[model samples]
Target: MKTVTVKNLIIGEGMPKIIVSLMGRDINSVKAEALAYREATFDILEWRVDHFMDIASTQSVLTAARVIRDAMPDIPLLFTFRSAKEGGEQTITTQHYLTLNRAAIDSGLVDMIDLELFTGDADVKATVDYAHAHNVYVVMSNHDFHQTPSAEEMVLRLRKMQALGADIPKIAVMPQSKHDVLTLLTATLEMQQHYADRPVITMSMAKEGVISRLAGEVFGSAATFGAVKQASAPGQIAVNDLRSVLMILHNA
Candidate 1:
């Protein structure tokens, strides 16, 4: 699988990489979390901008990004502002979403940016072009918390993200039953084997899908999300437990 190099981190190779989200609400909380996470087990830090209280101000968001970048220095930073329509905490206009992502990409403080896959096709392509021009990786994402799409449909969405110029395509689906979990894994493996040109991340959410979170390496997911202190998504294993499990899986 093709890998993405951000700082010293090489994603999409070896054991599946770990990404933890920082859900701080303000500058102070942001700094504290960033500082405290200086030597964490996770490989990437995603700033969940929707959780930030001052996300309405570009400067405030920039400052928060700076705080995280300065404190971590080497860890890869992924800037993400999940809209409420996609299970985010806050709702904003489409224009604001574009603006926020643009500001962060231009700031040069983040190594990667998470662009929602459902954003208008033209807008998503344009932003992706801009991100590439800025030398930042785009992780195009989609979340269906209600239920899992068919394995065929899931692969289709992931293929769409790749066609749209995403460096990494990711999907998170909520599984209503064990069968749904298998559907997610099937899509993941099929995508990796037949379709994926670059690394991809896939997960089945909630406790019922926890195995999908831990077995990414076996199933073709290049990375997994784990909780630092608080999880940004369902079925995220705690960082320590996650690492231990991955190590065992890798070594075995």
Candidate 2:
């Protein structure tokens, strides 16, 4: 797989990297978490803006970005505004989503941005192109909170993300049983081995899906999310504990 560099970190390599989510709702609260993460060993930081109290205000979002940038200067920052349909905190119109992402990209505050791949193709391409122009990497993602899709369908979604010029493609699914989790891992391994030209991130959420998070290097997931304070997703493990386990697995 091809590697993508963000700042000093190299993605798509031997060991799967850690990404911690900051889900604070306001400026001070978000700043606190960012500062705390500075002392953590995670490789990347994702600021989930949908959980922010002032997400409707572009200025507020930009302000919080600046604070986070100052707090964690060396860490790779990923800005995301997940839609309500995809298990996000807020529900926004398509235009509003585009506008918010555009503002974040133009501000030059984040190193990467997450855009929903399931959004209309035109909108996805538009935001992706804009982000690339600003030298910001795009992570095209799809989140299914209900059930995991068939392996074939999951691969198609990731391939479409690559064709659309995403730096990375990601998917998160809720598994109903152990078999569903296995389906997700099977798709991930297949994509990494035969299909994906760049790095991919995949997860089967909840307790049943925790193994996928820890076994990313073996299964071919490039990155995994861990918690700093609060988890943006259901199956996230604590950063310290996750880091220890990853080290043990990688060294073994």
Candidate 3:
């Protein structure tokens, strides 16, 4: 298994790294969220740009990123613009998506930018190439908010992401039952044990799938998402509570 080093954070090694999402609707709110996290324990800060009120303006988005970087200069920053198709708050055209990601990569403010895996292979590849050229990592993600896919399908998605040159391949899905959660865990283990060459993030979303978030260390996921003031996704554990659980499991 390979680990990804972003700034001081080493992903895919001992414990599952914790990522907190910044979900503010404006510049001040985004900056406030960043500042509020000054004393919080987290490895990565994912800016959910879809939640920003001024997301349509590229300059405003960049300014928000600058504010976040200014407040938390050391923490790894992941700029993400999740589309409505992928359970995000807003939707943008495909071209805009690529442009926004490229702008962020070119800005040199973010250490990582997320590109959805299903955003066409060519586009994903192009963005991956662009991000690599800019020395920024691409966290390619796919989200199925309705239900969990079969273990094989999920594995295939993860494999597809990896094949596309994504620095990190990630997927999240909603689980209807405990069996679905087990299937996600099974897929994660299989991907890690057989197919994955680099670290990946996998989670079964919603309340029932919370264990999948915590079992990453044992099941081969490199990172998990947690909430500071709010969670970007459905199954995120509270930051402090998540830290303690990870600690307990790590010690055991």
State the lDDT of candidate 3 residue by residue for 148-188, as single tens digits.
Answer: 99999999989888889988999999998899999999999
Candidate 3 TM-score, C-alpha based: 0.98
lDDT of each: 0.91, 0.90, 0.91
lDDT of 1 by residue, 1-252 (tens): 568999978888889999899989999999999887876778898999999988789899999999999898878999999988778999988898999999999988889999998988999999999999999999999999899999999999999999999999999999999999999999999987898698999999999999999999988999998997888988887899999999999999
Q: Mark the 10 consecutive residues where model 3 has the least summed lDDT.
A: 1-10
Best by lDDT: 1
Top-down lDDT ranking = 1, 3, 2
Candidate scoring better on TM-score of 1 and 2 = 1
Question: Which candidate would rank higher by lDDT, 1 or 3?
Answer: 1
Please report how far candidate 1 places residue 199 from its true position, in Å.
0.6
lDDT of 1: 0.91
Give the TM-scores of the predictions, in the order they appear. 0.98, 0.97, 0.98
